[model samples]
Structure formats: C-alpha cells, structure tokens
Target: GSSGSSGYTCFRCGKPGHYIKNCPTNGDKNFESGPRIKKSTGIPRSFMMEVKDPN
Candidate 1:
C-alpha cells in the first residue's frame, strides 16, 4: 500500500494512476521494479543549462 499524492495524468497516454515518472509502459518487460520513466520534454529539468557566450 503506497501513500502519496496521485499526481497528474500522463500527457502522452492519459492514464489516471500515477505520474509520468512512475509510468508503467516505460518499464522493462523482464524487470519488475525500475526507476521512474520520465519524458524528456514535458517535465522540467532539475538544473538549468547555461547559454554559450557570443562575442
């Protein structure tokens, strides 16, 4: 029994169970437990990348 905010539905699939991180489709077929499968674009990145300086 896990407990926490259910989070938002997946923008790609539109499922109402878990967030994009814990998305089941992104999981491996053989492996049962794996890290959350997050989308690269939709979610915000942890750190911001700096722009190169132009002369």
Candidate 2:
C-alpha cells in the first residue's frame, strides 16, 4: 500500500505467501480494499487509526 506491500499474501490460497487476497485464482481483481477490519460492538469515542510505514 505504498511503494511496496507484503500483508496482501493470500490466506485462502494457503497463506500470505500467496500474495493478493484473491490470489491463485482464475481472474484479476483490485484488492485495494486494504485491511479487512471488523467494527467492534463498542463505538469509538476517540480517534481510531491504522498506521503503516513505507520503510
């Protein structure tokens, strides 16, 4: 999600090493949806953020 990426390695294909969420498949799709986060039952009363470094 920067000049490069890593976490995208697919688990459905076995594990992250598959690289790309829908990897090892028969079609192409923009996996740019980013992280698959689930909203907690509790609402956040403050700033909520996810930070990644491009080092």
Candidate 3:
C-alpha cells in the first residue's frame, strides 16, 4: 500500500470508498443541504475599450 494524495468521500454519510456523486447516502436529493458556496464577487469584469486589427 502507498500514500494517497487525496480521497473523495460522501458528505452525506461518513463513509469511504465512494464519491459524493455516486453515494447512495446522497440519494436523488439534488439540493444544497450543507454549507453554501461563496458567491463570486472578486475582480469585476471589463471589456476592451479600443482595438485595431490590420489585414
């Protein structure tokens, strides 16, 4: 056996050897039942003011 970098586990149940996507503990409850993800309010988006292209 070797050291594993990371291992994904189910958030619904404290079980191993499974991903949160295919965890039976997380049935068809497609909704946020845990900590809400932080909204994106970082850098404001900006558009190009002037552009020149020669052909």
lDDT for 54 in candidate 1 is 85
The per-prediction CA RMSD against the true structure, in angstroms, equals: 10.7, 9.8, 11.5
TM-score of 1: 0.31
Better of 1 and 3 by lDDT: 1
lDDT (Cα, tens digit) per residue for candidate 3, span 1-55: 1135456456664345776677775666665543346544564543323455896
Task: Name model 3 segments beyond 4 Å from true.
Answer: 1-6, 28-55
User: Taking the tens digit of each residue's C-alpha lDDT, what string does model 1 give over 1-55?
Assistant: 1235554565434566676677666665563333347446665655455456788
The window of 10 residues in a row where model 3 has the poorest summed lDDT is: 43-52
Quote the RMSD, in angstroms, for model 3. Answer: 11.5
**lDDT per residue as tens, model 2, 1-55:** 2224554555443345565455655274633332445545686644445666999
* Cα lDDT for residue 8, candidate 2: 52
Q: If the candidates were sorted by their lDDT against the true structure, best first, what order would they fall in?
A: 1, 3, 2
TM-score of 2: 0.19
TM-score against truth, every candidate: 0.31, 0.19, 0.30
